[PDB]
Amino acid sequence: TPHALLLISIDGLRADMLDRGITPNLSHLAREGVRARWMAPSYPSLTFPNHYTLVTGLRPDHHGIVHNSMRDPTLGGFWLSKSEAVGDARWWGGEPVWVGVENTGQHAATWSWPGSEAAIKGVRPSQWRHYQKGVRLDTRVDAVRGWLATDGAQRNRLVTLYFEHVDEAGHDHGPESRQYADAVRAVDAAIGRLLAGMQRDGTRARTNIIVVSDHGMAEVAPGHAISVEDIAPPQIATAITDGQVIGFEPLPGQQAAAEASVLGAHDHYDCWRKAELPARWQYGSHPRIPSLVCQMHEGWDALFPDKLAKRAQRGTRGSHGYDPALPSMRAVFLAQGPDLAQGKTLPGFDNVDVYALMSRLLGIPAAPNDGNPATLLPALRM
Ligand SMILES: Nc1ncnc2c1ncn2[C@@H]1O[C@H](COP(=O)(O)O)[C@@H](O)[C@H]1O
Ligand SMILES: [Zn+2]
Ligand SMILES: [Zn+2]
């Protein structure tokens, strides 16, 4: 029986957060195994795009999950709480690792990984569920523990686990807040409980483990929110998305007026025609990207007008969705297990490279991807 892979995502864990004495279990795991200095997200540095990149090895511009919120001529609207969009395989390009696993006759079990509620390339994971808010930490850990222990024909080569808590605390209070640290500690402790349970079950020794995040988190101090309608008035363009990556579609005949007001450099953002976006972001070819894309500067939000209003103008907050090269946007990568190196540190690298490593650990043929297989070869024991 081949070694299983447990893939854990801690949404919004910034790379430096392993070095603050608040992750005893993850810090120990890293010392035992492999740790990268950091892992850069892909553009845009948002949750759905990056989680989907992690499991496909494709940049968002290629896999089609180009934002958390999207419009498509045929498929209509997509956003995180729109279940029949999220569950519709036609949005999701490429081949996520669970599809690869199921197509070899092996099985995958996913606790709420973006894309896992659809039948991508026709193939669902063997175990999966609809993402619900506020599931307990123990509930998910105990389910994952169960999935690792299953034997017979329902043995799982791949098991995935996802935590939202650090990201949510980050948004509400900022990455330097006690609330963000409390969340980091809590998720870390939960992961410790999982590891101890795997050891009691005798699954630990035959399971490789990768812990990642999708992006980091930057502070949004009070007064750092504008209206999307300050960028372009609604009569000349529609804001398709708000937050930090702001897509605009000019109204009919208004491309010139929209461009005149939007394009170029502004006080706390910059905007480009999608074909002209900075090449380093490797973004803007996909048809689902709006005609005009603005990037807010680090620490700034642009909100739909009704949100801006109910934004209780008081305390410090947090956001991501900023330039992926920023230190604040840096994510985590660490790994440990029977097939992984011991006591090793890796240079910082791009998140498209994780897929090649996972395909090797899962015994599946690597689908074509945007990563480099050379990057994570040193993470292997041999
Ligand atoms: N598979 C999923 N389906 C729906 N919502 C999710 C899923 N995974 C995470 N989320 C939510 O999306 C938010 C993360 O978005 P972001 O602010 O881009 O990191 C979190 O509050 C999660 O609760
Ligand atoms: Zn996220
Ligand atoms: Zn977030």
- The enclosing domain of 51 has a CATH number of 3.40.720.10
Do 135 and 10 share a structural domain?
A: yes
Q: Give the DSSP H or E segment for 80.
A: none
Considering only CA atoms, which of 283, 220, 176, 212 is closest in space to residue 15? 212
Contacts of 96 (CB under 8 A, 6+ apart): 52, 55, 56, 113, 115, 116, 120
Q: Which residue has the tokens 């937050």?
A: 243
Q: Is there a single domain that holds both residue 233 and residue 329?
A: no
Candidate list 23, 47, 53, 207, residue with the active-site label: 47
Range of the domain at 252: 218-320
- Given 298, 320, 342, which residue is the final one in a domain? 320
* Count helices and strands in the chain by DSSP H and E runs: 11, 20
Largest CA distance in the chain: 67
What separation in Å is there between the alpha carbon of 255 and the centre of ligand 3?
Answer: 31
Q: Give 185: exposed, middle or buried? Use CB within 10 Å, 0-12, 13-18, 19+.
A: middle
For ligand 1, what atom is nearest to the CA of residue 47?
18
Pairing mode of beta strands 301-303, 225-227: parallel
Among candidate residues 48, 55, 132, 130, the one with its CA nearest the CA of residue 367? 55
* Domain boundary pick from 281, 302, 320: 320
Of 191, 173, 184, nearest to 29 by C-alpha is 191
**207-212: strand order across its sheet:** 107-110, 156-163, 4-10, 207-212, 333-336, 34-36, 344-346
Whether residue 326 sits in one domain with residue 315: no
- E-only strand ranges, 168-313: 207-212, 218-220, 225-227, 237-239, 245-250, 264-265, 269-273, 292-296, 301-303
| Residues 333 and 280 grouped into a single domain | no
- Angstrom distance (rounded) from CA 155 to CA 353: 27
Give which of 99, 40, 46, 71 is closest to 319, Cα–Cα: 46
Cβ contact 5:163 at 8 Å: no
Residues at Cβ < 5 Å from ligand 2 ion: 11, 47, 167, 214
**With 0-12 CB in 10 A as exposed, 13-18 as middle and 19+ as buried, what is 153?**
exposed
Rounded-to-integer distance, Cα 279 and Cα 295, Å: 14
Residues in the chain: 382
| Inter-residue contact 307 to 239 (CB < 8 Å) | no
The 3-state DSSP class for residue 166 equals helix
Instruction: Of 220, 254, 221, give the one whose Cα is nearest residue 235.
Output: 254
Residues 24 and 162 in one domain: yes
- The whole-angstrom separation of Cα 101 and Cα 121 is 12
Name 204's Cβ contacts closer than 8 Å, sequence gap at least 6: 195, 198
Rounded to the nearest angstrom, the distance between the alpha carbon of 166 and the centre of ligand 3 is 9
Query: Mutate which of 13, 46, 47 to test ligand 1's pocket (most atoms within 8 Å of Cβ)?
Result: 47
- Non-local (6+) Cβ contacts of 313 within 8 A are 222, 223
* Domain match, 209 and 272 both: no
DSSP string, 22-67: --HHHHHHHHHSEEES-EEPPSS--HHHHHHHHHH---HHHHS--S
User: Which atom in ligand 1 lies closest to the alpha carbon of residue 321?
Assistant: 18
Q: Which secondary-structure segment (H or E) carries 321?
A: none
Residues 84 and 29 in one domain: yes
Alpha-carbon distance of 230 to 211, in angstroms, equals: 40
Q: Does residue 222 share a domain with residue 189?
A: no
Integer Cα distance of 283 and 272 in angstroms: 11
* Known catalytic residue at 150: no
Q: Which of 164, 150, 151 is nearest to 80 (CA)?
A: 164
Instruction: Give yes or no for a contact between 139 and 132, defined as CB atoms under 8 angstroms apart.
Output: no
One domain for residues 328 and 306 = no
Segments in 230-346 forming alpha helices (H): 255-262, 305-310
Q: What is the CATH number of the domain that holds 276?
A: 3.30.1360.180
Structural domain ending residue among the three candidates 287, 304, 320: 320
Query: From CA 85, how far away is CA 305, in angstroms rounded?
Result: 25
**Is the previous residue joined to 373 through a cis bond, with omega within 30 degrees of 0?**
no
Rounded Cα gap, residues 355 and 76, in angstroms: 29
Measured distance CA(379)–CA(359) in Å, rounded: 13
- Total domain count for the chain? 2
Resolution (A): 1.5
Alpha-helix runs per DSSP H in 60-156: 60-63, 83-86, 97-102, 137-149
Kindly state if the Cβ of 123 falls inside 6 Å of ligand 1: no
Q: What CA–CA distances, in Å, run from 346 to 32, 299, 377? A: 14, 29, 10
Shared domain for 27 and 62, answered yes or no, is yes
299 and 230 within one domain: yes
Backbone φ and ψ of 205, nearest 5°: -70, -20
- The Å distance, Cα 88 to ligand 1 centre, comes to 17
- Please report the sign of the dihedral spanned by the C-alpha atoms of residue 326, residue 188, residue 184, residue 141: positive
Same domain, residue pair 38 and 152 = yes
Tokens 């956003």 locate to 79
